């Protein structure tokens, strides 16, 4: 009887491996196996393997009552699981199944969903262990994320398999579950940032105040992440919020939120002056709740292009946020209220906007005009006319 | 009767050239140009070639008026694959396979004559500025790809290039015309590659060339970078990029020595700047190309251009010896070389120059914090 025939028993990992080695011209053994049976309304068994190396249409061998049928049945498993290798042996399915009598086979749909669920269950089992799950995640994290994007019925359990660096995780990629265990009691949102490297997003202005209130930020630093997070809207009832987007909501604090409204009142006239100087370069100028040491940042619209998203694909609406507790912003407010058409006010507004542009991941529309702004402001700093 | 390509061209009206071209191509317009010639001698053939009006290969091969094959790609180099027409050879065997043709010396001779007659046709079109514009808007990239790929015809292809220059206004002009306006002591043809005309025209790299009245060619298409790599000289004048190290201006007895005096004078600040910057650059040197800007970033003679490191680079920082910021910086650095504001200002100038020269910062937010420090300095704020 073939290896997949045997009640799940009497098989060592090295003979599972040799059979996985028969099936694949792999020179290493499998990283994982899931070997199950389904009895009942339908009857079939399946023996599935996760390889140790990402190979890059599935090649899962389909048998019917122990007779080989076909070698690349794409119906068997969704594309994001096409690294799975193995055998499926269905007890009752047409022996001459026409090649597209197949996308419509209902026996196959039941098989396929059982394959998907036992694969996800296998991945969860590997997760019940961190060492080997690291080895899996390094090879197939992009498969998990594309599953997030394309597979709605399985998106929750797939999200339980995501791992990310965070502001609290150090050198380790950790789970969303763990992030949730460390949340502050009045924290409703899961905060993330998208960017190119850990060190750019970790030191960005968008995290300053979140870092100083002790709030954890997830670092999503792969391009697929930008594509992944659009479909992953919540985890455990907590919604995912990007820190590079307008209208960041911090943990509920009645007293702190009153002082922020007072600051909005106080800076409303400077916001209109800046919005006037800047023209159509930004959509609005508003008071920030997310900055500490930096005077301003550029955030993108709620339903518009991310800075990283317009970076990634083609290479987006912008809001300028000003820090109400920054000496540069306070000085600027005083100069703008003494004279709004002051030339140095306009110069400083445009310079802060462009600097915020470079900080927020965008490109300048005229770098050398920007350079001459830098030179003028340097000469001011050294006392040169 | 007579196939059109065998007939005496004095007997063929352009309208009949056009109808034939339209049968060949199913083009709903007639040709933009036609070249119809014969070659006699040790090899004999006739050829009838057409330039289409629109940028889209299909040259039909006959032997002694017998149709042989329909897309003989080997008759003509790839950069001329928009040409359409017919070639009729007296000398090939009638059973010539496709494979003996790629290897054929007869074919090679035909191909060289087709190329030379195409280039001659393009020159004829260039005798009329307006119709030439319509050719050049469609096929300028083919000319530039020929520059890169065809070393034996590179000279004549270069006579077909047209560019905006600092002197041409809205008109794309020739290299010969650029040369007519060159200074008595100007050996080099200056160009700059970039993304838009206004970006290269107002760059720091042209400041001093513009103030000495020296003309700069604006190469603002992505193919341009690929093209100039191979186009090394025109009419004996070498092409020089103004974004590369070691720009040479026209000879001048007082300006050579004067510039050497400025190098001597800033040599010590250059070494301090180069120790502050570390490996971020290989050299800091005195510039001869800036006026209003204090510094710029230039790339190495045999290294990667900025446009090249976008797609996927050795950098020299040049400092303007006649700029108040550079002069102030020299005095501060010679009073004390470890001054914190010296280091901060040097790094700020370097990164600003990086942004200006088309490169990316490796940490935008560190750069931003430098900006903020220097803003507070200019406003009189402490930290």
XYZ file of N, CA and C in Angstrom, chain A residues 32-217:
558
model
N 7.653 20.314 6.484
C 6.506 19.882 7.282
C 5.612 18.947 6.477
N 4.788 18.182 7.201
C 3.840 17.235 6.612
C 2.504 17.343 7.329
N 1.427 17.225 6.558
C 0.068 17.087 7.063
C -0.556 15.952 6.282
N -0.974 14.913 6.985
C -1.429 13.681 6.358
C -2.769 13.323 6.971
N -3.852 13.507 6.221
C -5.163 13.355 6.827
C -6.101 12.593 5.911
N -7.207 12.162 6.513
C -8.300 11.498 5.831
C -9.588 12.252 6.105
N -10.492 12.187 5.133
C -11.855 12.665 5.275
C -12.780 11.507 4.942
N -13.644 11.173 5.893
C -14.649 10.135 5.759
C -16.019 10.784 5.852
N -17.009 10.154 5.232
C -18.357 10.665 5.355
C -19.102 10.848 4.052
N -19.730 12.021 3.911
C -20.499 12.325 2.710
C -19.628 12.207 1.469
N -18.383 12.668 1.567
C -17.328 12.431 0.595
C -16.217 11.645 1.277
N -15.363 11.007 0.481
C -14.316 10.155 1.039
C -13.024 10.345 0.257
N -11.974 10.807 0.939
C -10.693 10.995 0.265
C -9.596 11.109 1.303
N -8.351 10.956 0.860
C -7.237 11.262 1.746
C -6.175 12.083 1.032
N -5.382 12.785 1.828
C -4.428 13.720 1.267
C -3.176 13.720 2.114
N -2.041 13.826 1.439
C -0.731 13.841 2.068
C 0.001 15.043 1.493
N 0.191 16.079 2.318
C 0.724 17.362 1.879
C 2.012 17.719 2.608
N 2.925 18.351 1.876
C 4.263 18.674 2.339
C 4.545 20.142 2.091
N 5.177 20.758 3.079
C 5.792 22.072 2.947
C 7.284 21.858 2.730
N 7.845 22.324 1.614
C 9.297 22.264 1.414
C 10.016 23.299 2.270
N 11.345 23.143 2.375
C 12.158 24.059 3.170
C 12.555 25.310 2.413
N 12.551 25.261 1.088
C 12.939 26.392 0.261
C 11.759 26.810 -0.605
N 11.515 28.111 -0.674
C 10.508 28.608 -1.592
C 10.940 28.244 -3.002
N 10.108 27.545 -3.780
C 10.513 27.196 -5.150
C 10.591 28.387 -6.094
N 9.929 29.500 -5.777
C 10.051 30.744 -6.543
C 9.399 31.896 -5.784
N 0.863 27.508 -10.624
C 0.279 26.176 -10.783
C 0.958 25.161 -9.859
N 0.162 24.488 -9.033
C 0.696 23.503 -8.104
C 1.036 22.205 -8.829
N 1.988 21.459 -8.287
C 2.151 20.073 -8.711
C 1.799 19.228 -7.485
N 0.509 19.015 -7.320
C -0.016 18.032 -6.396
C -0.566 16.907 -7.257
N -0.133 15.683 -6.981
C -0.566 14.560 -7.787
C -1.968 14.158 -7.365
N -2.872 14.077 -8.329
C -4.239 13.665 -8.065
C -4.410 12.219 -8.518
N -4.848 11.380 -7.589
C -5.215 9.994 -7.785
C -6.700 9.839 -7.518
N -7.277 8.832 -8.152
C -8.640 8.416 -7.882
C -8.587 6.918 -7.600
N -8.936 6.531 -6.372
C -8.875 5.134 -5.908
C -7.531 4.508 -6.224
N -6.474 5.226 -5.885
C -5.109 4.759 -6.042
C -4.668 4.651 -7.501
N -5.416 5.197 -8.469
C -4.936 5.268 -9.853
C -4.562 6.717 -10.167
N -3.331 6.915 -10.633
C -2.860 8.250 -10.983
C -3.699 8.822 -12.118
N -4.151 10.068 -11.927
C -4.995 10.787 -12.889
C -4.235 11.926 -13.580
N -3.718 12.882 -12.813
C -3.091 14.032 -13.455
C -2.128 14.703 -12.491
N -1.239 15.525 -13.057
C -0.057 15.937 -12.321
C -0.087 17.405 -11.933
N -0.886 18.234 -12.606
C -0.967 19.655 -12.233
C -2.430 20.094 -12.304
N -3.188 19.705 -11.289
C -4.591 20.072 -11.166
C -4.669 21.367 -10.370
N -4.894 22.486 -11.054
C -4.817 23.768 -10.364
C -6.008 23.968 -9.434
N -7.149 23.362 -9.766
C -8.346 23.415 -8.937
C -8.110 22.980 -7.522
N -7.065 22.203 -7.294
C -6.935 21.496 -6.040
C -6.649 22.463 -4.907
N -6.001 23.575 -5.223
C -5.488 24.449 -4.182
C -5.348 25.854 -4.757
N -5.638 26.914 -3.988
C -5.468 28.272 -4.509
C -4.010 28.571 -4.797
N -3.806 29.621 -5.586
C -2.472 29.934 -6.080
C -1.510 30.282 -4.947
N -1.988 30.969 -3.912
C -1.056 31.355 -2.865
C -0.557 30.171 -2.058
N -1.155 28.987 -2.216
C -0.609 27.782 -1.615
C 0.053 26.870 -2.641
N 0.514 27.409 -3.772
C 1.017 26.521 -4.817
C 2.411 25.976 -4.531
N 3.004 26.296 -3.381
C 4.238 25.627 -2.985
C 3.992 24.271 -2.341
N 2.752 23.981 -1.934
C 2.462 22.707 -1.287
C 2.703 21.588 -2.286
N 3.342 20.509 -1.836
C 3.556 19.367 -2.717
C 2.893 18.147 -2.084
N 2.562 17.139 -2.876
C 2.009 15.951 -2.259
C 1.046 15.216 -3.174
N 0.151 14.472 -2.530
C -0.753 13.546 -3.201
C -2.144 13.761 -2.626
N -3.147 13.740 -3.493
C -4.541 13.691 -3.080
C -5.125 12.469 -3.774
N -5.850 11.635 -3.031
C -6.378 10.381 -3.572
C -7.859 10.388 -3.212
N -8.693 10.654 -4.210
C -10.120 10.787 -3.987
C -10.754 9.439 -4.282
N -11.697 9.040 -3.428
C -12.247 7.702 -3.587
C -13.334 7.670 -4.648
N -14.125 8.733 -4.771
C -15.153 8.790 -5.806
C -15.171 10.182 -6.429
N -14.653 10.207 -7.659
C -14.552 11.352 -8.556
C -14.430 10.714 -9.947
N -14.977 11.346 -10.986
C -14.921 10.762 -12.333
C -13.492 10.383 -12.726
N -13.310 9.206 -13.322
C -11.985 8.761 -13.730
C -11.524 9.420 -15.029
N -12.455 9.878 -15.865
C -12.149 10.534 -17.132
C -12.506 12.013 -17.085
N -12.450 12.606 -15.891
C -12.966 13.951 -15.653
C -12.447 14.890 -16.734
N -13.367 15.539 -17.445
C -12.924 16.417 -18.512
C -12.255 17.621 -17.883
N -11.297 18.184 -18.615
C -10.299 19.031 -17.977
C -10.920 20.267 -17.367
N -12.112 20.625 -17.810
C -12.819 21.693 -17.161
C -14.181 21.268 -16.623
N -14.514 19.973 -16.690
C -15.544 19.410 -15.816
C -15.070 19.591 -14.365
N -13.844 20.113 -14.218
C -13.042 20.211 -13.005
C -13.288 21.505 -12.211
N -13.281 22.694 -12.830
C -13.567 23.902 -12.048
C -14.982 23.865 -11.502
N -15.821 23.062 -12.143
C -17.192 22.882 -11.706
C -17.411 21.606 -10.875
N -16.364 20.831 -10.571
C -16.619 19.642 -9.787
C -16.884 20.061 -8.348
N -18.018 19.590 -7.803
C -18.318 19.910 -6.411
C -17.528 19.024 -5.480
N -17.263 17.769 -5.872
C -16.417 16.929 -5.027
C -15.067 17.596 -4.814
N -14.550 18.251 -5.856
C -13.262 18.922 -5.765
C -13.313 20.142 -4.850
N -14.404 20.913 -4.893
C -14.487 22.093 -4.037
C -14.385 21.702 -2.569
N -15.077 20.629 -2.190
C -14.994 20.140 -0.819
C -13.568 19.701 -0.505
N -12.927 19.009 -1.451
C -11.530 18.624 -1.286
C -10.673 19.859 -1.098
N -10.833 20.824 -2.000
C -9.999 22.009 -1.986
C -10.113 22.753 -0.668
N -11.324 22.908 -0.152
C -11.452 23.643 1.097
C -10.875 22.839 2.257
N -10.983 21.511 2.200
C -10.331 20.705 3.226
C -8.810 20.803 3.128
N -8.270 20.857 1.905
C -6.834 21.070 1.737
C -6.410 22.417 2.300
N -7.162 23.469 1.989
C -6.809 24.783 2.502
C -6.837 24.781 4.029
N -7.875 24.187 4.625
C -7.995 24.251 6.075
C -6.939 23.409 6.765
N -6.580 22.274 6.176
C -5.547 21.468 6.796
C -4.176 22.084 6.585
N -3.977 22.823 5.492
C -2.736 23.578 5.347
C -2.638 24.674 6.402
N -3.704 25.455 6.560
C -3.692 26.513 7.565
C -3.514 25.935 8.960
N -4.168 24.810 9.226
C -4.023 24.119 10.499
C -2.594 23.632 10.690
N -1.968 23.165 9.615
C -0.565 22.775 9.687
C 0.316 23.975 10.025
N 0.079 25.106 9.356
C 0.883 26.292 9.630
C 0.710 26.740 11.081
N -0.521 26.666 11.603
C -0.768 26.985 13.008
C -0.001 26.049 13.928
N 0.006 24.760 13.598
C 0.815 23.816 14.356
C 2.284 24.204 14.322
N 2.811 24.573 13.155
C 4.194 25.018 13.168
C 4.376 26.294 13.981
N 3.317 27.087 14.108
C 3.370 28.321 14.879
C 3.423 28.035 16.379
N 2.855 26.906 16.793
C 2.858 26.527 18.201
C 4.304 26.300 18.618
N 5.199 26.586 17.682
C 6.634 26.441 17.862
C 7.242 27.618 17.122
N 8.164 28.322 17.765
C 8.765 29.499 17.130
C 9.992 29.263 16.240
N 10.844 28.324 16.632
C 12.068 28.028 15.893
C 11.782 27.581 14.468
N 10.965 26.543 14.295
C 10.665 26.060 12.963
C 9.764 27.025 12.235
N 8.876 27.707 12.970
C 7.995 28.661 12.314
C 8.775 29.827 11.740
N 9.945 30.128 12.305
C 10.793 31.147 11.699
C 11.221 30.699 10.306
N 11.766 29.479 10.206
C 12.094 28.834 8.930
C 10.945 28.802 7.931
N 9.722 28.578 8.388
C 8.618 28.633 7.442
C 8.357 30.065 6.997
N 8.303 30.989 7.956
C 7.861 32.347 7.655
C 8.832 33.068 6.732
N 10.138 32.800 6.875
C 11.119 33.431 5.995
C 10.910 33.044 4.538
N 10.417 31.828 4.281
C 10.228 31.344 2.921
C 8.867 31.715 2.351
N 7.821 31.734 3.180
C 6.462 31.793 2.647
C 5.624 32.966 3.153
N 6.235 33.934 3.854
C 5.471 35.079 4.347
C 4.724 35.782 3.222
N 5.322 35.839 2.033
C 4.621 36.502 0.944
C 3.406 35.701 0.514
N 3.460 34.373 0.669
C 2.293 33.548 0.379
C 1.187 33.797 1.382
N 1.541 33.907 2.661
C 0.532 34.245 3.663
C -0.113 35.591 3.333
N 0.705 36.588 2.989
C 0.146 37.914 2.722
C -0.707 37.927 1.450
N -0.285 37.231 0.393
C -1.158 37.233 -0.772
C -2.439 36.462 -0.460
N -2.358 35.433 0.388
C -3.577 34.840 0.900
C -4.458 35.859 1.601
N -3.857 36.709 2.449
C -4.615 37.784 3.095
C -5.391 38.551 2.035
N -4.703 38.920 0.944
C -5.330 39.805 -0.028
C -6.420 39.119 -0.835
N -6.212 37.866 -1.229
C -7.110 37.234 -2.186
C -8.148 36.317 -1.552
N -7.944 35.870 -0.314
C -8.789 34.841 0.296
C -9.568 35.453 1.457
N -10.813 35.842 1.188
C -11.599 36.536 2.202
C -12.085 35.579 3.280
N -12.469 34.360 2.895
C -13.053 33.462 3.880
C -12.012 32.961 4.866
N -10.733 33.064 4.525
C -9.671 32.570 5.383
C -8.781 33.684 5.906
N -9.174 34.942 5.714
C -8.258 36.039 6.008
C -7.944 36.155 7.496
N -8.898 35.844 8.373
C -8.646 35.962 9.809
C -7.534 35.016 10.261
N -7.653 33.726 9.928
C -6.632 32.784 10.372
C -5.303 33.039 9.681
N -5.331 33.520 8.430
C -4.086 33.898 7.776
C -3.410 35.043 8.523
N -4.196 36.016 8.992
C -3.619 37.116 9.755
C -3.016 36.615 11.054
N -3.567 35.537 11.619
C -2.911 34.998 12.807
C -1.520 34.456 12.517
N -1.170 34.258 11.247
C 0.146 33.757 10.877
C 1.128 34.854 10.496
N 0.674 36.096 10.352
C 1.599 37.191 10.079
C 2.559 37.400 11.249
N 3.770 37.852 10.918
C 4.823 38.194 11.869
C 5.452 39.494 11.394
N 5.709 40.425 12.327
C 6.295 41.715 11.984
C 7.285 42.169 13.047
N 8.308 42.907 12.619
C 9.044 43.725 13.580
C 8.146 44.851 14.066
N 8.286 45.194 15.340
C 7.574 46.316 15.926
C 8.547 47.143 16.749
N 8.073 48.321 17.165
C 8.881 49.191 18.011
C 9.220 48.535 19.336
N 8.496 47.491 19.736
C 8.795 46.795 20.977
C 9.473 45.443 20.782
N 9.577 44.942 19.556
C 9.968 43.549 19.367
C 11.465 43.355 19.183
N 12.233 44.434 19.091
C 13.665 44.289 18.904
C 13.999 43.595 17.601
N 14.869 42.591 17.694
C 15.334 41.851 16.531
C 14.352 40.780 16.079
N 13.204 40.648 16.743
C 12.280 39.548 16.511
C 11.014 39.988 15.780
N 10.603 39.194 14.793
C 9.282 39.343 14.199
C 8.248 38.635 15.065
N 7.212 39.368 15.482
C 6.222 38.857 16.421
C 4.830 38.961 15.803
N 3.868 38.311 16.466
C 2.512 38.132 15.967
C 1.617 39.296 16.370
N 0.491 39.414 15.659
C -0.501 40.426 15.998
C -1.122 40.147 17.355
N -1.245 38.865 17.704
C -1.770 38.453 18.999
C -0.927 39.028 20.124
N 0.386 38.985 19.942
C 1.309 39.442 20.961
C 1.249 40.964 21.064
N 1.257 41.644 19.907
C 1.032 43.084 19.893
C -0.205 43.424 20.713
N -1.277 42.640 20.553
C -2.508 42.923 21.286
C -2.332 42.700 22.778
N -1.539 41.701 23.169
C -1.331 41.512 24.600
C -0.615 42.699 25.215
N 0.175 43.444 24.434
C 0.865 44.584 25.036
C 0.135 45.917 24.891
N -1.110 45.934 24.424
C -1.771 47.214 24.203
C -2.177 47.885 25.514
N -2.183 49.223 25.491
C -2.641 50.024 26.614
C -4.161 49.918 26.730
N -4.676 50.084 27.952
C -6.069 49.697 28.163
C -7.049 50.611 27.427
N -6.666 51.856 27.120
C -7.544 52.753 26.379
C -7.149 52.848 24.899
N -6.349 51.900 24.412
C -5.862 51.886 23.036
C -6.787 51.007 22.198
N -7.520 51.619 21.257
C -8.474 50.929 20.383
C -7.859 50.416 19.088
N -6.758 51.015 18.654
C -6.216 50.785 17.326
C -4.889 50.053 17.394
N -4.590 49.347 16.310
C -3.284 48.755 16.073
C -2.556 49.675 15.100
N -1.443 50.274 15.542
C -0.725 51.282 14.757
C 0.352 50.627 13.892
N 0.388 50.968 12.604
C 1.469 50.469 11.760
C 1.992 51.604 10.901
N 3.172 51.381 10.326
C 3.769 52.298 9.359
C 4.354 51.475 8.226
N 4.150 51.934 6.995
C 4.760 51.311 5.829
C 5.928 52.158 5.343
N 6.999 51.486 4.933
C 8.202 52.141 4.450
C 9.186 51.115 3.917
N 10.426 51.567 3.659
C 11.399 50.703 2.982
C 12.277 49.906 3.939
N 12.683 50.489 5.064
C 13.579 49.798 5.978
C 13.125 50.022 7.406
N 13.613 49.154 8.293
C 13.260 49.287 9.695
C 13.734 50.620 10.245
N 14.923 51.071 9.841
C 15.484 52.266 10.462
C 14.834 53.546 9.961
N 14.370 53.580 8.709
C 13.626 54.750 8.255
C 12.286 54.874 8.990
N 11.503 53.787 9.063
C 10.184 53.911 9.679
C 10.321 54.059 11.181
N 11.341 53.435 11.769
C 11.511 53.484 13.215
C 11.838 54.889 13.711
N 12.600 55.666 12.940
C 12.994 57.008 13.336
C 12.167 58.095 12.655
N 11.052 57.738 12.024
C 10.271 58.742 11.323
C 9.561 59.668 12.318
N 9.127 60.831 11.825
C 8.377 61.757 12.678
C 6.987 61.213 13.007
N 6.430 60.356 12.143
C 5.060 59.888 12.343
C 4.898 59.074 13.620
N 5.992 58.572 14.192
C 5.904 57.757 15.399
C 6.298 58.519 16.663
N 6.817 59.753 16.539
C 7.390 60.451 17.696
C 6.480 60.398 18.924
N 5.280 60.956 18.802
C 4.427 61.028 19.977
C 3.903 59.652 20.368
N 3.682 58.747 19.396
C 3.282 57.396 19.783
C 4.383 56.723 20.589
N 5.649 56.983 20.237
C 6.733 56.383 21.003
C 6.798 56.971 22.404
N 6.435 58.240 22.563
C 6.643 58.823 23.881
C 5.474 58.519 24.816
N 4.302 58.187 24.271
C 3.198 57.692 25.081
C 3.269 56.193 25.321
N 4.359 55.542 24.918
C 4.507 54.114 25.128
C 3.706 53.233 24.196
N 3.272 53.748 23.052
C 2.426 52.976 22.149
C 3.253 52.284 21.080
N 2.910 51.027 20.822
C 3.685 50.160 19.954
C 3.244 50.332 18.503
N 4.216 50.337 17.599
C 3.969 50.532 16.178
C 4.532 49.341 15.430
